[PDB]
């Protein structure tokens, strides 16, 4: 259940963390970007499988703040990941030219190599990935960066299909819990995205999904 990061991933996480120290906001750009990709992947799959979207009729990104529990949730209803995929796609990488371009901006570089997930550790002490893939049951990937574990989700299939990224925010990254801030940041980083992105918001005092693009 417990796993070690591959060396290159450790180096990569460091390079990422040690080059975007200034513009931390990028983590949210990249998570929204990967969320879109997940939906693309499942839409494509839906072209040749009418049963592809059975676990969830919708194709969205839902973002939820939990100021109280110090958590930020980003949930796509994309393709999701199987257990094996969690262990492989988040624990290794398929690359070393990337690690040399990185040393010699660099926010555009991680975006290009599709490896911006790890930027989440810029604002989080622990990162949790809850994922339901059509071919598998719901599993959970957790890491504080020093290792990771993948477990079967005891709650069963709550996602229907897809992925929630959950960030336990750092002391200094509390700013990103304010609904003001996240609405603002998603507005910015979600224009080019063509799936709907909602933020769970407060209107006059009620709560519902609010569309941001
Ligand atoms: C898009 O794949 C995912 O399931 C997914 C998601 O739905 C939301 C996310 O925030 C993230 Cl990070 C992912 C995984 C995408 C990812 N980032 C780094 C590695 N990976 C796995 C991966 C990379 C390339 C391909 Br092609 C497939 C999976």
Author numbering: 74 to 167, 171 to 180, 187 to 286, 329 to 337
The study reports:
X-ray crystallography was used to determine interactions between 4-Br-BnIm and the Grp94 N-terminal ATP-binding site. The crystal structure of the N-terminal domain of Grp94 in complex with 4-Br-BnIm, reveals a binding pose in which the resorcinol ring is anchored into the ATP binding pocket via direct and water-mediated hydrogen bonding interactions with Asp149. Additional interactions included an apparent electrostatic pairing between Asn107 and the chloride-substituent of the resorcinol ring. Electron density is not readily visible for the brominated benzene substituent of 4-Br-BnIm and the adjacent Grp94 loop (residues 165–170) that caps the ATP binding pocket, suggesting that several conformations of 4-Br-BnIm may be present. The structure of the N-terminal domain of Grp94 in complex with 4-Br-BnIm revealed a pose in which the bromo-benzyl moiety was not locked in a single conformation. Thus, we infer that this region of the inhibitor is sampling multiple binding modes, including the novel hydrophobic pocket targeted in the structure-guided approach. 4-Br-BnIm represents one of several small molecule Grp94-selective inhibitors under development to overcome the liabilities associated with pan- Hsp90 inhibition. Mechanistically, inhibition of nucleotide binding domain of Grp94 inhibits the apparently irreversible binding of mutant myocilin, enabling degradation via autophagy instead of continually failing at ERAD15. Here, we demonstrate, for the first time in vivo, that a Grp94-selective small molecule, 4-Br-BnIm, cleared mutant myocilin, leading to a reduction in glaucomatous phenotypes of IOP and rescued RGC dysfunction.
Grp94, the ER resident member of the Hsp90 family of molecular chaperones, stabilizes mutant myocilin. Compared to WT myocilin, which is secreted from TM cells, mutant myocilin variants are sequestered within the ER, where it forms a non-productive interaction with Grp94 that precludes clearance and leads to toxic accumulation. Specifically, the nucleotide binding pocket within the Grp94 N-terminal domain differs from other Hsp90 isoforms by an insertion of five amino acids. Thus, Grp94 harbors a unique, largely hydrophobic, pocket that can be exploited in inhibitor design.
